[PDB]
Structure formats: C-alpha cells, structure tokens
Symmetry: C3
Subunit: 168 residues, 3 copies
Amino acid sequence: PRGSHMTLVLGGIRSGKSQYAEQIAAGFGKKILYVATARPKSWLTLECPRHVASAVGESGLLDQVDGVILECVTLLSSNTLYAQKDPTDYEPFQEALIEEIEALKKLIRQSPVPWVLVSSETGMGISQSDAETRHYCDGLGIANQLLAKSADEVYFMVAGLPLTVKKG
Amino acid sequence: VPRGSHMTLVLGGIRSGKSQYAEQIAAGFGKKILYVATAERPKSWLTLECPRHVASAVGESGLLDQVDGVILECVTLLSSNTLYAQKDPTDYEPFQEALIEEIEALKKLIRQSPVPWVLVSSETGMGISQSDAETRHYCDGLGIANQLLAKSADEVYFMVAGLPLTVKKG
Amino acid sequence: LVPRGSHMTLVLGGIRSGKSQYAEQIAAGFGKKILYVATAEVRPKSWLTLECPRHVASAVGESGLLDQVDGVILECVTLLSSNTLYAQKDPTDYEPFQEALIEEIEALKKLIRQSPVPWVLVSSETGMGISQSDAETRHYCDGLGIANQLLAKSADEVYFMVAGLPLTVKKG
C-alpha cells in the first residue's frame, strides 16, 4: 500500500510477526526506515527508545524513504514504564504511553509514506502478581487497541500465519 | 455492532476491548440493560451484584422482566469467586464441580430468559503454564466454563486489540 | 470427481481450548482405524494407541503401523517439546535443545511427507502471556513456537481453537 496507510502486525512469542512485517515493508518499496525502540543495505535505521513521533519527524527521513517499519510497540511501552518515577503507579505510566501513541498516530496520519508496526500480544495468559508487569501488560494492551483502531489493516499472527483482523 | 443474538459470548485478554464491545452489543438490545456484576455507564441501566450463584440471584431479583437485555461482567471473576469460596483452593474437583454447576444454572436461566444476554469472559490459557496448583485450577476451570458458554452461545467473538474476530455466528 | 481430505492438519490452542476433541473429530474423519500417538513421558475402540515420548518419526516408521491404519493423530507437540527440553544435559542452555527439537520436528515433517495416511497434530499456544524471567521457561516457549511455525508452514490446514471453537488460519 501507498500513502498514509497503516498496518499493525501483532502476535506472541515466536509467532513470525517480524518476518511478516518485513514482508509488508518490502512491499512498500526499496528504501525503508527501520525505527528501532529497544538487514537490507538500502534500509535506514533510526534508533528511538522514546518519543518516536518527535524523533522521526525531526530526522526528516520520512521524505527520504518508501515506507517505515516500527520494531516494536512492546519495547516502546516498557521503556515508557521504566521512564516513570514510580513504575508501580499505573496512572502516570498510562498517561505517558497514551501520549506517545497519540503522537505516533498523528505523525502517521500526516506521513507521506506508509507504516507497518510490530507489537506483542501479552494479555492472554495468567495475570502476574507484581504491579510492574501487570501495568506493562495493561498499557501495552491499551497501546495495541489505539493502534488497531486507527490502523487500516491489522494482522494477528498464529504460528507464522496471519489472521486478518481488519482490512481496508 | 451485531444485532438479534439471544446469547453472545465476548472473550479476550487483558485490555482487549471486550467490555466496550459487549456494552455496544448490549446497547443494541435496548435502552434498559441489567448489568450483572460478579466482583467481590448509562444511567438507565440497572446494576445487580452477584459474586456467586448468578442464576439464582438474577431469577430471584425478577429484574429480567424489567429490562431489554443483560450484560454479565464477568465470567472470569465468577470463576475466581467460586474457586476461593471452596474449603481447599488447591483441590481441583470440588471447585470444578461448583463452577460447572454455576455455569449450567446460568445456561438454563439464559434459555428461559425473556431478554437477550451478552457475557464477558477472559482468555487466560495461551501463556506459560503456572506452577502453583491454585492458578492451574483457576485457568483450567475458566477455560471449561468458556467452552460450555461458547457452545450454548448463538454468537461468539474473540477480541484482538479492541477488534472482534467472529468465532461463531448464527 | 472424488474429493480428497487434508493430508496434514495442525490444531493448536491454549489450556482447555477443546483442541483435543476437535482433533479427534478430524481423526475419526480419516477413517475407523486411527493411530493415536501419545507423547506423554512414560476413545474409540477401533483405535490403536502407540506411546512414543521421543523420536516420533523413527518409532512410527519403524513400527510399520502407517500401513495398517486410516490416519494418525499426534497428541501432542507440547509434550514432545518439553520431553526434548528435559532430555538435555543443561535445560538452561537454549541451543542444544533447539537443535534437538528442530531435528524432531523436521523428521516428523519428512515422515508425514512420505505417509500413505493423513495426520492431525495437536499443539499448544504458549506465547501470548507475559514473558517469564527464568531462562528455562523462555527457552521452552521459544522452541515450542518454532516447532509450531515449522508444522504450520508444512500443514495443509491449520486451526486455532478458541473456547472449543475453531478459527481457520490456513485452508486449501
């Protein structure tokens, strides 16, 4: 796809989501911006542990590429949690992560090139006891909801194969 | 927003949007909704709190004759309440027996219900298996309850990040 | 024109997802004589039960039983992977376990490719919760996910079970 098109690819551990997202990115074009939040030589890498929208817009690199792949919403959410004063307090973390995600959504709406985003599903096991991990799971689920609802396409990976959750 | 299902099951993980989607379905029932809360929102809705014995409490309230539909929040807490009301939560069989009785009574009440129901439950079985028998038992019993309800339900939706996958539709 | 069934089916799901009941229905669809391969570390009466905790392809082929039945149901990839993990010297070391599990899975795929009768395989989804801290559990989850990817890529049909009901992930 071309334009301000957005695809969300989510799945569990070893679900093949990164491979599938890279296929989608290759479908965008040959010059891909790889945004890492923690490989083809025509791809550019921009490393942004936080404030992804600001850093990508300031880089001006959206005007240089055919598309963007974001790896990954999971680490963006954990980075946001551990940047807070008290990782055991849910509300400030949630506010910060929503801010991050809304800035990303806005940048994508205005983006000249399409984006594919990789994220993790972590909410379908047994709930953990310590507040930090619970908060991280909760906030990641919220981020994934926001992205899926704004995305044009959403794919849920099961054992390397994509289930279409939302399509054009 | 689906319409005209008598019994709908909406299940999903943590922060999957299952409550929002179930409330949309409920609003599709009508303006007067009975909200059955199992813990232990529109102003025209009635709230009935029943941590256990949901079929018994709802039938005894007579409120099914007062509303356009019912939303049950949630099977997850119903199962945990059932587990912890037992003498020995590390003992599987009494818990499973009690939970199955609860679910079968709920199914019968829904079969006889004059108004439709949407039920919210959680998927908890697709992570790493837990070590303590109590958590294993809870996960197991909730999965069994979800199977019984999904088989009875007319429609079943599996939520992924706020969006519904149709698992079963009449 | 006589239709043909699915030669290789993968049924995966979580705890109490109804994956075993659905797979057994598929197996019964194969025919009346079904080989039930149980992998647990050591049902219709027309079925034969073969206990094989490890080296499934070798034991099943050497048994010559593929020529005796209408189909095979493998219960289950989950226990095959855990057996493989705990048969290693150091379960905290990922690479030897991964090699052994991949060898097991590739041998299974090869035998299924040669099989005169269809197969349905039961496995678990374990990768959609919170990542655990201890290396051993992460290793197990990772390796099982790899095994499921390998089988799903080879399978003709793949079903993901939710609360007893099948979602079709791959067909035809």
